[PDB]
Structure formats: structure tokens, C-alpha cells
Amino acid sequence: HHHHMYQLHVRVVEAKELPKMDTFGKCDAFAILQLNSSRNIHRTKVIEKTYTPVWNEEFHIPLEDVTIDTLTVFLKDEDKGSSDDPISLIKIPINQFPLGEVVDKWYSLIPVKGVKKGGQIRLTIHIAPLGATPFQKTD
Ligand SMILES: [Cl-]
């Protein structure tokens, strides 16, 4: 009863404590968001030459099942002319967000093999029924 079509509203705010990924420069970071293993895959812009990138980008991702869905956040380094250079990732269970609540917090990204630190990323997440205003508490 009372079937709802939930959406994941996610603001990829900023990150800090990113690793130096090459001999020169600092980090040219962007985040990749993926729901489950689906083709709902989104990318932020690249912020060049900083360990403290600020994206402040919002994405609106339709959900399949709020009791089991997972958001994976991959942090990677741009490598022009070559493939993305992976930094770190985290898998976030959608079922841990109180429905309708706006949760702003920092997440500890797990560095991949060979990477000296993973960084921390700030996300504002709101799991909201369709029709509710994004990023405002839903009553
Ligand atoms: Cl798909």
C-alpha cells in the first residue's frame, strides 16, 4: 500500500585530503556515482590541481528499491589521453538513510591498491518520494 517512486537526490559537495597522483601537480579529481551495477552512472566535473576540490553538483537518480539499493562513489583522477586513474571508492547503502531526511556528512573513501590515501568526501543525500522538494525535509 501507498506505493512511492523514490528518488536519490545527491549533492557531491567537496573532498579533502586527496593524494598526489603523479610526479607533478596535485590531483585532478572527479567523482563517479553509480546506482547498484546499473547504467545510472554520473560524473562530476574535473577540478584541476587541488587536494581540496569543490564540485557542489546535484544529481537526481531514480531508485529501484530503497530497502536494498547501493550508491557507489568512485573518486578518480583525470589522465587526458588515457583512462581514468582510480583513487578510492565507497559503497553507501541507501537503506541507511531515514526516508525523507536530508543527510549532510563526510565519508571515508577507501584507497585502491597503490594509492597512498583515499580522501574524504562530503555528500548531501536526500531519499525522497516523487513530488517532494529535493534537499528539504519531507514530512
Ligand atoms: Cl541499467
mmCIF file of C-alpha atoms and ligand atoms in Angstrom:
data_model
loop_
_atom_site.group_PDB
_atom_site.id
_atom_site.type_symbol
_atom_site.label_atom_id
_atom_site.label_comp_id
_atom_site.label_asym_id
_atom_site.label_seq_id
_atom_site.Cartn_x
_atom_site.Cartn_y
_atom_site.Cartn_z
ATOM 1 C CA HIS A 1 0.000 0.000 0.000
ATOM 2 C CA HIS A 2 0.961 3.645 -0.613
ATOM 3 C CA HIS A 3 3.483 2.742 -3.286
ATOM 4 C CA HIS A 4 6.021 5.520 -3.805
ATOM 5 C CA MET A 5 8.613 6.129 -6.507
ATOM 6 C CA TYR A 6 11.649 7.311 -4.586
ATOM 7 C CA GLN A 7 14.490 9.370 -5.975
ATOM 8 C CA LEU A 8 18.034 9.774 -4.704
ATOM 9 C CA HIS A 9 18.974 13.445 -4.570
ATOM 10 C CA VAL A 10 22.720 13.667 -4.065
ATOM 11 C CA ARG A 11 24.857 16.789 -3.859
ATOM 12 C CA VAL A 12 28.521 15.952 -4.407
ATOM 13 C CA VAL A 13 29.865 18.830 -2.370
ATOM 14 C CA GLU A 14 33.628 18.643 -1.947
ATOM 15 C CA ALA A 15 36.528 16.440 -0.911
ATOM 16 C CA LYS A 16 39.711 16.846 1.073
ATOM 17 C CA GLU A 17 43.000 15.120 1.855
ATOM 18 C CA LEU A 18 43.375 13.747 -1.649
ATOM 19 C CA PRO A 19 46.650 12.087 -2.680
ATOM 20 C CA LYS A 20 49.200 13.424 -5.109
ATOM 21 C CA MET A 21 48.631 11.157 -8.105
ATOM 22 C CA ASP A 22 51.711 11.928 -10.226
ATOM 23 C CA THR A 23 55.270 13.192 -10.059
ATOM 24 C CA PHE A 24 53.993 16.715 -10.780
ATOM 25 C CA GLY A 25 50.807 18.569 -9.982
ATOM 26 C CA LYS A 26 48.418 17.811 -7.198
ATOM 27 C CA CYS A 27 45.210 15.943 -8.081
ATOM 28 C CA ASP A 28 42.666 16.495 -10.903
ATOM 29 C CA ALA A 29 39.724 14.847 -9.246
ATOM 30 C CA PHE A 30 36.174 13.979 -10.218
ATOM 31 C CA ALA A 31 33.587 11.650 -8.733
ATOM 32 C CA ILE A 32 31.587 8.897 -10.405
ATOM 33 C CA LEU A 33 28.216 7.913 -8.938
ATOM 34 C CA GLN A 34 26.665 4.545 -9.748
ATOM 35 C CA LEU A 35 23.410 3.037 -8.522
ATOM 36 C CA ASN A 36 23.878 -0.721 -7.958
ATOM 37 C CA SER A 37 25.627 -2.081 -11.101
ATOM 38 C CA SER A 38 23.266 -0.201 -13.421
ATOM 39 C CA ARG A 39 23.924 2.203 -16.281
ATOM 40 C CA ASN A 40 22.702 5.033 -13.996
ATOM 41 C CA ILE A 41 26.275 6.372 -13.913
ATOM 42 C CA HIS A 42 27.005 10.071 -13.421
ATOM 43 C CA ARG A 43 30.240 12.052 -13.381
ATOM 44 C CA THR A 44 31.096 15.386 -11.821
ATOM 45 C CA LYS A 45 33.323 17.972 -13.413
ATOM 46 C CA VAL A 46 37.093 17.759 -13.033
ATOM 47 C CA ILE A 47 38.678 20.210 -10.590
ATOM 48 C CA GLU A 48 42.287 20.672 -11.694
ATOM 49 C CA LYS A 49 45.320 20.935 -9.425
ATOM 50 C CA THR A 50 43.879 20.748 -5.923
ATOM 51 C CA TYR A 51 43.765 18.364 -2.993
ATOM 52 C CA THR A 52 40.534 20.075 -1.813
ATOM 53 C CA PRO A 53 38.180 20.027 -4.819
ATOM 54 C CA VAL A 54 34.768 21.636 -4.567
ATOM 55 C CA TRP A 55 32.204 20.450 -7.106
ATOM 56 C CA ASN A 56 28.902 21.461 -5.498
ATOM 57 C CA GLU A 57 26.942 19.467 -8.078
ATOM 58 C CA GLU A 58 23.473 17.962 -7.698
ATOM 59 C CA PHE A 59 22.224 14.717 -9.261
ATOM 60 C CA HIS A 60 18.740 13.227 -9.253
ATOM 61 C CA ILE A 61 18.790 9.448 -9.628
ATOM 62 C CA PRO A 62 15.624 7.296 -9.760
ATOM 63 C CA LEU A 63 15.782 4.433 -7.273
ATOM 64 C CA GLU A 64 14.751 0.819 -7.706
ATOM 65 C CA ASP A 65 14.210 -0.326 -4.113
ATOM 66 C CA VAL A 66 15.113 1.840 -1.131
ATOM 67 C CA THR A 67 15.470 -1.263 1.051
ATOM 68 C CA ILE A 68 18.410 -2.684 -0.964
ATOM 69 C CA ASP A 69 19.864 -0.111 -3.385
ATOM 70 C CA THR A 70 23.502 0.923 -3.113
ATOM 71 C CA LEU A 71 25.245 4.106 -4.195
ATOM 72 C CA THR A 72 28.888 3.590 -5.140
ATOM 73 C CA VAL A 73 31.041 6.710 -5.229
ATOM 74 C CA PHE A 74 34.342 6.385 -7.064
ATOM 75 C CA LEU A 75 36.901 9.150 -6.839
ATOM 76 C CA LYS A 76 39.259 9.254 -9.821
ATOM 77 C CA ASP A 77 41.978 11.419 -11.323
ATOM 78 C CA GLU A 78 41.733 12.712 -14.870
ATOM 79 C CA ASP A 79 44.510 11.443 -17.174
ATOM 80 C CA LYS A 80 43.957 13.132 -20.523
ATOM 81 C CA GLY A 81 44.585 10.862 -23.487
ATOM 82 C CA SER A 82 44.344 7.796 -21.244
ATOM 83 C CA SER A 83 41.814 6.126 -18.969
ATOM 84 C CA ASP A 84 40.582 7.435 -15.619
ATOM 85 C CA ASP A 85 43.204 6.923 -12.882
ATOM 86 C CA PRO A 86 41.442 5.436 -9.831
ATOM 87 C CA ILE A 87 41.898 6.953 -6.382
ATOM 88 C CA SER A 88 39.346 5.473 -3.971
ATOM 89 C CA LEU A 89 35.736 4.414 -3.538
ATOM 90 C CA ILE A 90 32.930 3.817 -1.051
ATOM 91 C CA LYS A 91 29.701 1.801 -1.208
ATOM 92 C CA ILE A 92 26.832 3.549 0.613
ATOM 93 C CA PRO A 93 23.634 1.592 1.485
ATOM 94 C CA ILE A 94 20.537 3.590 0.571
ATOM 95 C CA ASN A 95 18.619 1.728 3.316
ATOM 96 C CA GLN A 96 20.617 3.576 5.989
ATOM 97 C CA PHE A 97 19.079 6.985 5.159
ATOM 98 C CA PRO A 98 15.890 7.857 7.053
ATOM 99 C CA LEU A 99 13.300 8.329 4.353
ATOM 100 C CA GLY A 100 12.699 11.998 3.604
ATOM 101 C CA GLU A 101 15.607 13.293 5.726
ATOM 102 C CA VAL A 102 18.437 15.431 4.346
ATOM 103 C CA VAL A 103 21.767 13.995 5.499
ATOM 104 C CA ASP A 104 24.946 16.058 5.060
ATOM 105 C CA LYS A 105 28.109 14.278 6.175
ATOM 106 C CA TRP A 106 31.639 13.217 5.337
ATOM 107 C CA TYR A 107 32.547 9.763 4.036
ATOM 108 C CA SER A 108 35.914 7.982 4.272
ATOM 109 C CA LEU A 109 36.942 6.784 0.826
ATOM 110 C CA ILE A 110 38.910 3.542 0.711
ATOM 111 C CA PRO A 111 42.075 3.939 -1.391
ATOM 112 C CA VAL A 112 42.655 1.420 -4.177
ATOM 113 C CA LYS A 113 45.858 -0.616 -4.457
ATOM 114 C CA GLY A 114 48.963 1.551 -4.764
ATOM 115 C CA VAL A 115 47.240 4.779 -3.656
ATOM 116 C CA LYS A 116 48.692 6.381 -0.546
ATOM 117 C CA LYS A 117 45.462 7.846 0.882
ATOM 118 C CA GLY A 118 41.844 7.802 -0.172
ATOM 119 C CA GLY A 119 40.487 11.219 0.687
ATOM 120 C CA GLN A 120 37.266 12.151 2.437
ATOM 121 C CA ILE A 121 34.190 13.301 0.522
ATOM 122 C CA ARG A 122 31.193 15.348 1.644
ATOM 123 C CA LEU A 123 27.818 14.353 0.222
ATOM 124 C CA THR A 124 24.354 15.673 0.976
ATOM 125 C CA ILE A 125 21.839 12.906 0.360
ATOM 126 C CA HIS A 126 18.042 13.014 0.419
ATOM 127 C CA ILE A 127 15.902 9.930 -0.331
ATOM 128 C CA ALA A 128 12.584 11.486 -1.251
ATOM 129 C CA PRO A 129 9.246 10.417 -2.708
ATOM 130 C CA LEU A 130 8.495 11.767 -6.138
ATOM 131 C CA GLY A 131 6.898 15.212 -5.834
ATOM 132 C CA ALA A 132 8.749 16.226 -2.682
ATOM 133 C CA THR A 133 11.091 19.196 -2.902
ATOM 134 C CA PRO A 134 14.709 17.975 -3.157
ATOM 135 C CA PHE A 135 17.002 18.731 -0.225
ATOM 136 C CA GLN A 136 14.209 19.814 2.135
ATOM 137 C CA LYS A 137 12.941 17.535 4.893
ATOM 138 C CA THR A 138 9.904 15.597 3.646
ATOM 139 C CA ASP A 139 7.015 15.348 6.116
HETATM 140 CL CL CL B 1 20.752 -0.421 -16.311
#
